[PDB]
C-alpha cells in the first residue's frame, strides 16, 4: 500500500479516472520505477472490489504470458481481443477459438508494453471500445519507437501524446544501487556506454584485439552447449548481423552445419495459418502465433512445384519440409511448414511472386484476374529464426537472466532509435549484461 509518490499517485489517478467516467489513463514508468510491480496492485485491489469487466491485453504473444503468469487472470493479444486483425490488418474476423471474453462489455481495458503501437492499431482500438471501456496502459516512452514503414515521422506510440490519454510519469528509482539501472538511466539521456563492475553480476564489455574471442569465449562459458539458452541472450540490430551469430552459436552448441537440426527449438516469425475452404468462402484458424516457441521433429531438404494461372512454365523452388510440435505452455498441435534457408534461392521465389504481378496487374485474357494462387502459394511458406540470437526489435517484453549485445551494426540507426535500442538493449538481462 506504501510506495513512492508516483506509485501512491498512479493507483489513485487510475481509480479516480475509471470510477469517474471520461478520463483516459496511461502510465510511463521507465526502468527501475517498478512498473511491473505497480501494475499488480492495480489488479489485486480491483478483483477484491465490485468493479467488473476487467479484461487484460498484450500487444504481442511474448508479453501475454509474463502478465497472465504475473496476475492470475487470463490475458490475450490486443489483436485476439479486438476483432482480430492478423499480420495484415482486418476487422471483425475471428480466426482462433477460445471463447475469448472479448465481449466489449467492460468498464476497464488494460494493456501493457505500450511502446509498440503504430497509428494503425490505435484507430481500430478507438473504433472498437464501447462508451464505457476506459483504457489504462503502462509502458516506457524511451523504448523503441513503433515500426511504421509508411511514415517518415519518427514518432513514439500515441499512448503518450493523445488528448484523453493524459499520462502520469514515474521518476524515482528505488533499488539504491543497481549497475544496470545506473546504466540505462544515463543511456536514455544519450551517453550510450561505460563499464561498471559490482559483485561480479553486472555489466562489462570487451575491446581490443580479441574483442569477440574473449566476448564469445565468455558466451560459450556461460552457456557450454547447455541447450538451455532461454535465459542467455545475444541481441543485434540488423538481420545480416544475426544470421551470422546463431550460425556460429549453433556450430558449437548443435554440432552441424545444417541451418536446421532435429530436436531443436525454434521461434516463429509469422502466424502459421491453417486455412480451410467452406462453401466456397475461406476461413482460418491460427495454430502457432508469431512469438510462439515450437520444436522440430523431422528434418528434410526438398523441392516443390510452384505455379500460377496465366503464367508459363514451371519454376524451381528448393525449401525445407519440417514437422513441428508445440512447446511450452500452449495447447499441443502438430503440423508442418515450408521454409527456404538460402539467400541464393530466396530470390528465386520472389521472381515467381514478381513476374506473376504483371499478369495480374492486367489479366484481361478473359474476365477478371485469378489472384487466388498468388496468396495461396505465398501462404505456403513461413519465416523463422533461432532462439539463441534474436534481433533488438523483436527482443522485448521478456526479461532474461544474462544478456549479450552487438554494437557495430548500430551505426545505421539514427540518433533517436539508438537510445531506444540501447535502453531495450541493456534492460533485457536482469543481472548480467555483456556487450562489445
Amino acid at each position: 500500500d506504501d510506495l513512492t509518490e508516483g506509485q501512491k499517485n498512479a493507483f489513485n489517478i487510475v481509480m479516480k479516472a475509471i470510477k469517474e467516467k471520461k478520463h483516459h489513463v496511461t502510465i510511463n514508468g521507465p526502468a527501475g520505477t517498478g512498473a511491473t510491480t505497480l501494475t499488480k496492485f492495480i489488479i489485486e485491489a480491483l478483483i477484491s472490489t465490485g468493479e467488473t469487466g476487467i479484461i487484460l491485453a498484450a500487444p504481442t504473444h511474448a508479453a501475454k504470458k509474463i502478465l497472465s503468469k504475473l496476475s492470475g487472470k487470463e490475458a490475450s493479444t490486443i489483436h485476439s481481443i479486438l476483432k482480430i486483425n492478423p499480420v495484415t490488418y482486418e476487422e471483425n474476423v475471428l480466426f482462433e477459438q477460445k471463447e475469448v471474453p472479448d465481449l466489449a462489455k467492460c468498464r476497464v481495458l488494460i494493456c501493457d508494453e505500450v511502446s509498440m503501437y503504430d497509428r494503425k492499431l490505435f484507430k481500430i482500438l478507438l473504433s472498437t471500445i464501447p462508451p464505457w471501456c476506459t483504457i489504462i496502459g503502462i509502458g516506457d516512452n524511451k523504448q523503441i519507437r513503433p515500426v511504421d514503414p509508411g511514415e517518415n515521422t519518427a514518432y513514439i506510440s500515441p499512448f503518450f501524446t493523445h488528448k484523453d490519454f493524459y499520462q502520469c510519469e514515474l521518476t524515482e528509482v528505488k533499488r539504491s544501487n543497481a549497475p544496470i539501472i545506473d546504466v540505462a538511466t544515463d543511456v536514455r539521456n544519450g551517453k550510450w556506454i561505460y563499464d561498471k563492475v559490482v559483485d561480479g553480476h553486472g555489466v562489462r564489455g570487451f575491446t581490443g584485439d580479441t574483442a569477440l574471442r574473449d566476448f564469445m569465449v565468455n558466451y560459450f562459458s556461460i552457456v557450454k552447449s547447455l541447450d538451455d539458452l532461454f535465459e542467455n541472450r545475444v541481441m543485434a540490430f540488423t538481420n545480416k548481423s544475426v544470421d551470422k551469430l546463431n550460425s556460429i552459436i549453433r556450430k558449437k552448441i548443435f554440432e552441424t552445419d545444417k541451418d536446421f537440426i532435429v530436436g531443436e527449438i525454434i521461434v516463429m516469425q509469422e502466424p502459421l495459418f491453417k486455412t480451410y475452404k467452406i462453401d466456397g468462402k475461406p476461413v482460418s484458424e491460427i495454430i502457432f502465433n508469431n512469438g510462439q516457441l515450437v520444436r522440430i521433429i523431422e528434418a528434410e531438404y526438398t523441392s516443390t512445384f510452384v505455379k500460377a494461372r496465366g503464367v508459363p512454365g514451371e519454376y524451381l523452388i528448393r525449401h525445407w519440409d519440417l514437422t513441428v510440435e508445440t512447446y511450452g505452455d500452449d495447447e499441443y498441435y502438430r503440423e508442418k511448414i515450408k521454409i527456404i534457408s538460402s539467400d541464393e534461392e530466396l530470390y528465386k521465389f520472389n521472381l515467381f511472386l514478381g513476374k506473376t504481378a504483371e499478369t495480374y496487374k492486367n489479366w484481361n485474357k478473359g474476365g477478371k484476374a485469378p489472384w487466388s494462387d498468388f496468396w495461396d502459394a505465398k501462404s505456403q511458406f513461413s519465416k523463422v529464426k533461432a532462439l539463441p540470437a534474436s534481433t533488438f526489435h523483436k527482443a522485448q517484453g521478456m526479461s532474461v537472466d544474462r544478456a549479450f549485445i552487438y554494437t557495430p551494426c548500430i551505426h545505421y540507426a539514427d540518433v533517436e532509435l539508438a537510445q531506444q535500442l540501447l535502453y531495450v538493449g541493456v534492460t533485457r538481462g536482469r543481472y548480467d549484461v555483456f556487450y562489445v
Binding site: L212, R213, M216, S241, K244, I248, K252, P408
Partner: peptide
C-alpha cells in the same frame, strides 16, 4: 585514436569471417 568508425569495423569484419571453428 577516436576512430569509433574503424574500431566498429574491426569488430564488424571479425564477425564476417570468424575464427576457424574449434
Amino acid at each position: 585514436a577516436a576512430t569509433a568508425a574503424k574500431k566498429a569495423d574491426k569488430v564488424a569484419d571479425d564477425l564476417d569471417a570468424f575464427n576457424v571453428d574449434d
